[PDB]
């Protein structure tokens, strides 16, 4: 009986699409013909174990298309999951793909209930509901991690829908019904609350990582053992032994990332906290780059530009800011990134062969330790302590 | 067979003193004759349920004195628990009571092993061990909360001793032996690590509170419901539903408290994080005071100057910064603080009678909600949401 349309087929879109398609008609809409074509062949266009396997082994009422009229037709719900983020040039939060999908749906099927899953600024929903004069827009935050997308939906921490209504609960049941986890905590709120819940949840996660990275910098510069200190600190149950693995800096979260983005949007965000994670991150990259330059390297080898294993994001990857700082000093950099087709990145040679890379670099820096590097461990610089995230 | 001396009898000192006195000879040394006199009469000089009751109902090998020669004589361990904190005038971290007790013990019983429990700056132990030429000084952080002092020792999150040695484990066993909780996680480290573990654990707790207070400010200024937002944010298990009750600002932790203390000690502490909690706290008090002044009050009534129920600390209490801000505007303030003998505080009248206070104040502000105020709830301003800490 029920038809759900996903507008945008990135990992957030497919995650929800596949979850719901176990019991309902799901139609995935995208603007890239080629991704759509593979989806229709049951081939996942992104790396994510469960998405790839549910799409090829489980019976799903799922299909993809680049046709919005066929996609939105008779849709009961349209989940919006198109790209949103702060623009790196203008520094304004860019919500144009979402604006666009809303005008389209309003135009093509003003009876569908639109659930926004893409992160948006606090107050976006209330404002657009008013600027266009519609009422069928509801925000519902996404809390999943790239690479565990479907997984986090099959076992969600919780579900938050930005509307207190029957249609809002109807949607929550769709999500609970597809999930493996039972008794998912479910909270119904207004849309501005729900947007703020997303903003603050991410702010905190970024804050936690920023904090462990200062702690780690502090230990390193003071000659202390990071791991014993973190163990000691995390034995306090109010702090916890989780999400505490030092790195070269954090990236992502749809949070202003430098002080220019913070300034262009202060007042949409909690000013002191953001200022804090932004300054800590900038500071962490200076410390890390300084720490690498002190080993007086001749050629630095950057091992992987993606941040998390199996990722497809370079944008938000802190190793970039390290390269930037080392190159500022004139040190040559070579890169080992299989996912990268380009032969040079900001003019640094991208070496295709792992062994040639290992031989040419006197210092190899890597955000997380890796098996492939075990044989050159003696020249590997990483602040990874636990091997997770 | 074993004798332990506690130098300093505040709640940290008595906590440990009573814990250990269940199975060993404990002698408490203080410089205030009157406190000592009451201890010898089995009367606790501080409010703390378990300390008062263990001291008066359990068989303890415990006594107090103002005589250092008798106190330190034949002591195997001397636990140092004298006052340390940033001085509010010079802004330097003041460790003089601890310096003093160490010269004394070195002088009187250079064979006792000194365990510092008072919070000290990172590197203090290593440095003093060297400046004096002694070796019997070990730092071991205290993680207890005023009012639950003995309680937190009977059920500690963990035990950290700043030394890897037999004498260090001997001490850890004293602590484990007195405890009710079993299998206490125990970590042995060097002293600088152990000092940093204390610094960072407190930094994080202050950070968490600072964060929930921005979140709360953000909601209030945006018209949102704080409680739903916090519920939503805390349903993420990486964040947790604990230690998240909004207040007028945090106080304490032996952390630099304003930017002058931060500046006088930057480089002993994690610069960006501290700068962040300090700015957030200053900002929270501006927001709260502004929020109270907007109710255009004629007389503001400050209900309790202590921060936590049953506390004896005014120093670190954020309601002070609120008074300061409201008085800056010329609004009269009256105070209801039974623990305070003074008839005026910074020239604001301290009203002794709760009913007269209730009648004279058009706005009553209070850090946590209280039963006594239920009948005037309509004019009570508090940001307390959960009724805890
Ligand atoms: O809105 C989002 O974008 C998502 O952001 C993160 O998901 P994700 O960035 O894919 O994975 P994380 O593990 O949270 O990594 C976040 C950042 O912190 C860093 N990090 C994370 C964990 C850690 O222990 N150490 C560490 O340095 C990562 O390398 C990365 O820079 C959150 O975990 C999700 O809940 C949220 O929905
Ligand atoms: O130079 C930049 O591109 C950016 O640097 C900062 O943004 P931020 O995120 O704080 O930069 P970092 O994390 O410190 O470094 C990442 C950036 O370095 C650049 N990059 C990367 C690799 C490289 O070899 N050289 C290089 O300049 C990339 O554009 C990447 O965005 C500034 O705040 C931005 O104004 C500026 O756009
Ligand atoms: O070294 C110390 O001094 C101690 O500091 C705190 O103990 P305490 O300050 O007595 O009690 P807390 O409950 O942690 O209160 C800390 C501050 O945060 C505020 N707070 C705390 C918790 C909360 O949910 N909301 C909140 O505003 C309190 O009013 C106060 O300003 C820590 O909890 C102890 O582990 C630590 O040993
Ligand atoms: O005016 C001050 O005494 C202090 O204010 C700040 O220190 P901070 O902790 O950031 O001050 P707040 O928390 O904003 O306010 C607390 C202070 O206000 C003062 N106070 C209290 C009550 C009152 O009615 N008037 C008043 O001035 C007390 O001295 C108390 O220390 C400044 O950073 C310090 O330089 C200065 O010593």
* Domain positions in chain B: 1-198, 199-288, 289-389
Arch. (CATH architecture) of A1-198: 3-Layer(aba) Sandwich (3.40)
Proximal ligand: closest to the CA of A11: 1
For ligand 4, which residues put their CB under 6 angstroms from it?
B 257-258, 260, 282, 285, 320-321, 323-324, 327, 346, 348
Strand (E) or helix (H) holding B56: helix B49-57
Residue among B324, B327, B346 to mutate when testing ligand 4 (max atoms within 8 A of CB): B324
Chosen CATH of B199-288 out of 1.10.1040.10, 1.10.620.20, 3.30.930.10, 3.40.50.300: 1.10.1040.10
CB contact under 8 A, B222 and A185: no
Compute the distance from residue A200 Cα to the ligand 4 centre, in Å.
30
CB-based contacts of A111: which residues, under 8 Å, 6+ apart?
A136
Give me the sign of the Cα torsion angle A2, A6, A9, A10. negative
Compute the distance from residue A98 Cα to the ligand 3 centre, in Å.
43
Are B45 and B36 in contact by the 8 Å Cβ rule? The answer is no
Of B190, B235, B283, the CB nearest to A157: B235
Q: Which ligand 4 atom is the nearest neighbour of the CA of B285?
A: 14
Phi/psi-derived region of residue B123, left when phi > 0, alpha when psi is between -120 and 50, beta in every other case? left
Compute the distance from residue A12 Cα to the ligand 1 centre, in Å.
15
Name the method of structure determination.
X-ray
As a whole number of angstroms, the longest Cα–Cα distance in chain A is 67
Hey, whose CA ends up nearest to atom 7 of ligand 3?
B145
CA pair distance A94, A112, nearest whole angstrom: 24
Of A196, A273, A280, the CB nearest to B224: A196
Fold match, B199-288 / B289-389: no
- Give the pairing of strands A113-116 and B380-381: unpaired
Are A381 and A364 in contact by the 8 Å Cβ rule? The answer is yes
Q: What are phi and psi of A120, to 5 degrees?
A: -130, 160
CB contact under 8 A, B219 and A196: yes
CA distance B9 to chain A (A): 25
CB contact under 8 A, A157 and B237: yes
Token readout for B127 is 């440095």
Residue among B258, B286, B292 to mutate when testing ligand 4 (max atoms within 8 A of CB): B258
Residues paired with residue B219 on neighbouring β-strands, in sequence order = none
Are A138 and A109 in contact by the 8 Å Cβ rule? The answer is no
CA pair distance A58, A55, nearest whole angstrom: 6
CB contact under 8 A, B236 and A157: yes
Are B93 and B84 in contact by the 8 Å Cβ rule? The answer is yes
CB contact under 8 A, A187 and B229: no
- CB-ligand 3 contact for B84 (6 Å cutoff): no
CA pair distance A72, A58, nearest whole angstrom: 25
Q: What is the resolution of this structure in A?
A: 2.7
CA distance B95 to chain A (A): 21
Indicate the SS3 state at residue B282. helix
Are B9 and B51 in contact by the 8 Å Cβ rule? The answer is no
Q: Which residues of B are catalytic?
A: 254
Closest CA to A336 of A361, A354, A323, A312: A354
Nearest CA in chain B to A144: B236
Hey, whose CA ends up nearest to atom 13 of ligand 2?
A321
Q: What angle do CA A235, A241, A247 make, to 5 degrees?
A: 125
What is the CATH code of the structural domain delimited by A289-389? 3.40.50.720
Are A112 and A171 in contact by the 8 Å Cβ rule? The answer is no
- Give the pairing of strands B348-350 and B344-345: antiparallel
């Amino acid at each position: 009986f029920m038809k759900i349309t996903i507008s945008g087929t990135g990992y957030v879109g497919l995650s929800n699409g596949v979850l719901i398609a176990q019991n309902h008609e799901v139609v995935a809409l995208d603007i890239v013909q080629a991704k759509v074509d593979m989806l229709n062949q049951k081939i996942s266009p992104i790396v994510d174990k469960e998405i790839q396997e549910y799409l090829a082994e489980k019976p799903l009422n799922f299909r993809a298309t680049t046709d919005k009229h066929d996609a939105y037709r008779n849709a009961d719900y349209v989940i919006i999951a198109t790209p949103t983020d702060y623009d790196p040039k203008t520094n304004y939060f860019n919500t144009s793909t979402v604006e666009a999908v809303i005008r389209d749906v309003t135009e093509i099927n003003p009876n569908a209930v639109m659930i926004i899953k893409s992160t948006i600024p606090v107050g976006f929903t209330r404002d657009i509901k008013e600027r266009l004069g519609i009422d069928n827009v509801i925000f519902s935050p996404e809390f999943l991690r790239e690479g565990r997308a479907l997984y986090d939906n099959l076992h969600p921490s919780r579900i938050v829908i930005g509307e207190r209504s029957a249609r809002a609960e109807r949607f929550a049941d769709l999500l609970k019904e597809g999930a493996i986890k039972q008794d998912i905590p479910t909270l119904f709120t207004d849309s501005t609350e729900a947007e703020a819940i997303k903003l603050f949840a991410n702010t905190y996660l970024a804050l936690r990582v920023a904090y462990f990275n200062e702690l780690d910098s502090y230990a390193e510069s003071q000659g202390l053992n990071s791991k014993q200190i973190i163990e000691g600190v995390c034995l306090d149950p109010r702090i916890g032994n989780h999400y505490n693995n030092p790195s070269f800096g954090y990236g992502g979260y749809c949070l202003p990332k430098d002080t220019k983005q913070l300034l262009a949007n202060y007042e949409s965000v909690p000013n002191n906290i953001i200022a804090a994670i932004v300054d800590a991150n900038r500071t962490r990259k200076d410390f890390i780059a300084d720490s690498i330059l002190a080993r007086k390297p001749k050629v630095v080898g950057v091992y992987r530009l993606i941040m998390k294993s199996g990722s497809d994001n370079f944008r938000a990857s802190s190793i970039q800011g390290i390269m930037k700082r080392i190159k500022a000093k004139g040190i040559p950099v070579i890169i080992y990134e299989p996912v990268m087709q380009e032969d040079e990145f900001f003019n640094s040679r991208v070496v295709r062969d792992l062994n040639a890379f290992k031989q040419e670099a006197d210092v190899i820096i890597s955000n997380r330790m890796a098996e492939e590097l075990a044989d050159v461990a003696d020249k590997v610089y990483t602040r990874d302590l636990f091997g997770n995230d």
